[PDB]
Scaffold this active site. Structure first.
Site, PDB file in Angstrom:
ATOM      1  CD  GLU A   1      31.741 -26.710  -3.909  1.00 24.07           C
ATOM      2  OE1 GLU A   1      32.277 -26.659  -2.773  1.00 24.07           O
ATOM      3  OE2 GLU A   1      30.803 -25.973  -4.266  1.00 24.07           O
TER       4      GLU A   1
ATOM      5  CD  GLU B   1      26.894 -27.661  -4.137  1.00 21.29           C
ATOM      6  OE1 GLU B   1      27.250 -26.703  -3.393  1.00 21.29           O
ATOM      7  OE2 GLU B   1      27.376 -28.836  -4.075  1.00 21.29           O
TER       8      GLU B   1
END
Ligand code: NA
Ligand code: NA
Lengths: 489, 489, 489, 489
Positions: free
Chosen positions: A207, A384
């Protein structure tokens, strides 16, 4: 039933900083994020929760019990991070490498075997040995290991986030400094060289869009360095792009295993049909700009041969959508949906929202997978997906629904190779601290014991059967609203 | 872990009328409750939901699949009812028995073998044969069978509830007629004579206090005959007492197996310390009056040798508490707690309330078990405990918490022999219809398929281990409030 | 009835920046707060609402209609601010004054008549003339005028809040620069010299504690310069203390009218009896430190004769409490009460919370008045009290309840001279923009029309009668909870 | 502003039983409704609240203070009921009249002067004298008086509601007995003969549809006799039709003043366009059937010349809508809207619901007025409109919005002659007791003091100006949702 291929991976993802500390001898004070969350001004302002990672779930010491639970749950993969701050708590700048730097551009970084040996002399032995120990045990359970090199904290020698918050931009400045790119290539080469025999696939970073965006633009999030500076966000973004590419090359010089990246995603959905173009702009600005850089070499209007083709697989993180409405030729994210909801509220679409205020929107996972697939046709791993849910109220539905959507993507031809839930156990949720509980397993932070939420038993069913079985398919549905908080209207 | 004895029974309870219908050939139109729920005036008034049992979960036809799920869940016992209306859809009055009736008092009913043979000639063969079929299959799974003779519906020939609602008390009047007592003794003898080889223990009846109280006092509940008449409530109560005693004797003349009764309970808790005496009055009026009659022979200030000692075991049904406050020398039940809460609200004690408005109060199960034990020292079986919970939000906590309390009772010396959840699957909840969902298994009423809620997987853990395992003990706790409806303040 | 003295003032308070703009020709772009709320980074971060003051209620042009409504409501006083940025949009540094500055300490500032004439040459004529026009009209309605010199915005030449946010502390730095103290003395002298004939009483400044605290500590509030720096907060505090004292002296050199200060207050209430000492620490740190400086000359452990006795009256702003719990020898403010509640929630004390998340706690106004009275025995004026309440749900109760508490203070001997509601009309609520609506009058920001909420009619009753009349005394009570949002539990 | 004609009446409506009792000497135990609400079985069942009218607001003794408040509020009309049970507590059957009865049909009832004198001998003098006293005072304030003869309670000699509940239909049976029609004609003639000089207009009865429908069909409402019997509902309806017609004729034989009827209305709105025909069926069944009888003489498929033309004006009571959806060739009322909402919830249309669960739907008042006007073109008076609202949260908006809709009707040509709010003060709301508070004035039932809610001040503005003034027009809007309870989703 909804049946997955024989080789499809069901597992979990986990970050070092979020999960490692909590057991004696595990404390790592040498990261920007550690400093950041202990900073008294940040605590007093409410930028950070006041909770500290050293009171966390203790994976560093208790990894065997995490692995025991994962093995009992039938999990076959884990994506787990290593912390640069643990491995190189002291600066590596002095290690000579062969880099071509033209102003802001790092075009190459070659890390020689001499450099790797010098790095090994500087590395924290306990750290690297302990990572081998943990990941060796992980593998001994039949769990395939995806190693993620970076998951936000930097060594303090690379970033003094308090000095940066204060506007002292001559202090160590993290991703605002091209030197961090070169140091990251060194780090990445070192870790691959040390640990490759344990690794199935690599991710350079997790991320990076959160790092640049929360760090420098969305400063109320309480992420370091919390220096409100849109130009800095752009500089950090570019350096993260370059760091990815240079890490890819460095790791590939050591191993031919797949090297990918993990990114934070939302499904950008138009509020009305009139907002379709605005949603497309949002996808580009928030998603394609990064991937076009590291896949196609396209950055800032120019093409870089040193960036092109630096990706073997894409890790899709997905939690919820963002609803977009056109605003002139720009766009805006509509509050009350997606990431922008009332905690434990309900969106105008009638979808319940998590403890974090994130809307229940499993359809978006299909959309995001499909969109990445259609654009790049690189293998995808759902790296995720999960929910902050202290009661396990929504999680069972959230789990099953999102797994179903992955299956739908697969049926439509998307090469998705696995699903990794965030997370096996509760952990330190950044500026929010411990109160955001994403585990299949609840953590008692006093005892460090792990406790199975009912969703963990549902996931065991899925993982052991490699299917959404007939018994649990009904959970592919929206949680009933009546019993949940209504929020405010 | 919280470990139960090797021989402790984990299972479920189930009613005929609530669960049988829904499959072709199962419809039983010949009961007061069937008539009651189809009555247009009752539907229009909202006394009943408008849902009908013939659209129900279909145990009559699909029993094997219910049993499959129970066996998969590790369950070792079931308490299941038979329906008098199915077995004797036509009147049995003409079958001669040797009864001593002195006005309102039925002191004895002796059912000869000639009478049993005459009853057999009148019995519905398909019904009794099908009960043998279902219960034989149940037993073939390693599930011990507790047969409950009565669970509210009466044959229409015994009770025209619409005529009674209308005040035509000369119509067949159910438990207002001593003849119903004698007919019940006949029925009970017949069923034992037919089915004893399948039965471990008998219960004469389920929650007779609901029958008299909801039928004639709490008429907004929408229970038949809904004839507001406190004197009638008392008459029905006495006849249910006598029916129990005469059924006990009739069954004992056939079999020496244990014969008990199942009763609806609340923990009557005082609002303040000043209300302790009021809570004790509530216990007597609502609980001990019935049991002192059938155990000690004490009824209405007189002792009856024909009632004394007519109980071998007590089935404790328990859902929640009732909070009591003194009102002069009487008492009142405090709204907002216990059974009297807002659906999906929260009590002033901070306890979440179910879809039915029932407060989360597991401690009361310990208290009720302890109190029955201390008073009578008869073996106890938790014959119902469960929650209306369409989302499975509270149920996992409810299950584990209540099981824990049973263990606590056991540890303190209460002879509790098992725990039967209400229920295996969703079913027709009386005047509330299908929208109150008490199953470990969700029922899709369109397809008749059973679906495992996560609580079902938790119960499998408990039943298979005969323990609250270390993995699930954390569910012995109150559901977190933030994510649930707050109700109104 | 609850009757006030014949001379007791009922009125309202109002800020220039919050209320002036919205009519053609009124825009004032020359303040730090204007820049701050238009800053794209701040908007994107959500630090500020994105609403702009130039779309506001338009008092600059429409003052006569505000005054008409106040006169119709029977109001007899107004505290209204003037904006330094309007009057001196260009720097006044070059105007020579006789100041004694010893490092950080400004011990005196004497503003000669020559300096006043030079200032007059630099002043914006339209601005000062328009203030005379507005305040002359105000007075023509029988409304006594309390002039407040400062209500947060600074001229941009004194403070570039964006440069400061960015950490360029050499940019114009507002209250971090002792020069701002001297310039404020000049400004204050000028305004008194120009407008004194219209003024009943002066306040030097409004809520300086918000300026230092939100500006430099509670940075998530979105107040300028939003530079997280506890040392800066302390520096700003000291400079605001000195600014008050030097303004007091400057105004007193021109006029002998009363000169006071207006401050933001909470009642600091202990969570438990064990927290009483902690509550006292909170009062000192948050309240007495400032007043002991400007009343008693006590600052930072030293006594300054140039600070002592620089206060004639105290303006008490009060909205709600802060609940305090001891934390070691320190203290902490307990979330869920006071200022820290859920918007439109309910505190654990059962008190409803406003649209801003502020708890209904009228008792605190008595306590705060009593405490200031007992400490200093200076005349008190309730200079703000009100509620963000778009529906007028709580406001009627809030108004009457707080007025009652003022009466209680008076009865107990506190010299409270009036009650000024915040506010007559809705206005621009700082970083929150227009959505926090504090008016007795609703503002339609499209039409600029004023609309009477029912609370305005209640206030007319109070002001015209100088009493809480028998008809409205019932509003001295807590709003019923059932109909209001419950928040989350 | 929204301005009404000079002669348009603003006032209130009030019932005897709901408001009279509460002062010493006022108790009237001689009505079915009194017996009903004191009945222990009804109390225990929750059919009635347990509150009693004798603890009510005390208009009987305190009328002057009610009138004082009305006069202060600028009200110019009141519709107030008289209680038959007070005036004739003993039976009047023996008074001979000239009636033509053909089975169920009462075609005429002529009440001679001899009969009136005999009635006068039987009448309770204190009662009739006290009514003159109260209504004389009312008139002395400039308040025009609309006398309503019947507002639900019957003398006990005409109706033993407990005996009827119990199904003893030979007991005095109220509107199931044609004799009640004849007795009502006698009563109506008597009251007109006694009081005509005080009366502007007469209404025979209030909401007869509630009497028949709640009494015999919607029995969970807790209205007497609560005897579930659809045939009885129809019989009562017909007798109320006949009672109206015979009362009309009897009153007209004494006075030529206008004689009308007051009826309970909803706007029946279709859920979807496909439900328009269903909504029309609902209007006929629930509204036109009664009015076609008393206007057009059409009843049950036959036309009766003795029913035709028996109406001079129509009193429209209106609180909210009912949403209708087609169900085959029938229809059903959709829960969650209109009368069928969650108390203090929000409908799916986003409209807040009152303390009674009634949806905010002012548009329906226009629709209902328009529909009655278009059908019959008889003068209309809004005889009730109000809200159960203990906090005065919605009432200000409710008041202004509904008044606006009346104006809209007027503008479109509907002859609406006035608006009467329900009610001036809180009162005994039938089976709900005192907790449903409909007043412009709050009643303290302990002290019997009247307290002005802010809505009362709004109504004063309207009544004194005969306009929705510019200051309050903004209240013609839906209450903001955020601050109100959200209910459940
Ligand atoms: Na759950
Ligand atoms: Na209000």
């Amino acid at each position: 039933a909804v049946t997955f291929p024989k080789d499809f991976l069901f597992g979990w993802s986990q970050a070092g900083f979020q999960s490692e500390m909590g057991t004696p001898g595990s404390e790592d004070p040498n990261s920007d994020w550690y400093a950041w969350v202990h900073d008294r001004e940040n605590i007093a302002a409410g930028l950070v929760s006041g909770d500290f990672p050293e009171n966390g779930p203790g994976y560093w010491g208790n990894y065997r019990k995490f692995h025991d639970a994962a093995q009992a749950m039938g999990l076959t993969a884990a994506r787990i991070g290593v912390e640069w701050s643990r491995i190189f708590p002291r600066p590596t700048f002095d290690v000579k490498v062969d880099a071509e730097v033209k102003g802001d551009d790092v075009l190459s970084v070659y890390v020689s075997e001499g450099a790797l040996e010098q790095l090994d002399k500087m590395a924290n032995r306990d750290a690297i040995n302990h990572y081998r120990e943990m990941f060796s045990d992980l593998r001994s359970r039949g769990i395939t290991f995806i190693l993620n090199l970076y998951h936000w904290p930097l060594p303090l020698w690379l970033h003094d986030p308090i000095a940066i918050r204060r506007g002292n931009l001559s202090a160590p400045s993290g991703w605002l400094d091209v030197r961090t790119v070169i140091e990251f290539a060194k780090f990445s080469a070192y870790v691959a060289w040390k640990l490759d025999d344990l690794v199935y696939m690599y991710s350079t970073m997790n991320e990076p869009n959160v790092v640049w965006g929360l760090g420098y633009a969305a400063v109320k999030s309480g992420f370091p360095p919390g220096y409100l500076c849109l130009e800095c966000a752009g500089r950090a973004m570019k350096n993260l792009v370059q760091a990815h590419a240079r890490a890819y090359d460095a790791v590939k010089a050591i191993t031919k295993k797949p090297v990918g990246v993990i990114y934070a995603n939302s499904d950008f959905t138009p509020l009305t049909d009139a907002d379709r173009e605005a949603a497309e702009r949002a996808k580009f600005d928030n998603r394609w700009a990064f991937f076009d850089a590291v896949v196609r070499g396209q950055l800032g209007g120019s093409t870089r041969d040193d960036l092109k083709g630096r990706l073997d697989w894409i890790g899709v993180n997905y939690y919820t959508r963002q609803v977009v409405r056109a605003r002139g030729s720009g766009y805006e994210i509509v509050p009350g949906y997606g990431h922008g909801c009332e905690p434990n509220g309900v969106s105008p679409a009638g979808r319940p929202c998590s403890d974090f205020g994130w809307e229940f929107y499993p359809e978006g996972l299909y959309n995001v997978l499909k969109e990445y697939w259609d654009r790049y046709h690189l293998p995808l791993l759902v790296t995720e997906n999960g929910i902050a849910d202290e009661g396990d109220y929504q999680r069972p539905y959230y789990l099953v629904s999102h797994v179903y959507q992955v299956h739908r993507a697969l049926q439509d031809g998307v090469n998705v190779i696995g699903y990794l839930h965030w997370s096996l156990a509760d952990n330190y949720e950044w500026a929010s601290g411990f109160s955001k509980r994403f585990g299949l397993l609840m953590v008692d932070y006093s005892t460090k014991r792990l406790h199975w939420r009912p969703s963990a038993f549902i996931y065991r069913e899925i993982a052991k059967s490699r299917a959404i079985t007939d018994e649990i398919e009904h959970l592919n549905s929206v949680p009933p609203l009546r019993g949940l908080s209504p929020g405010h209207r």
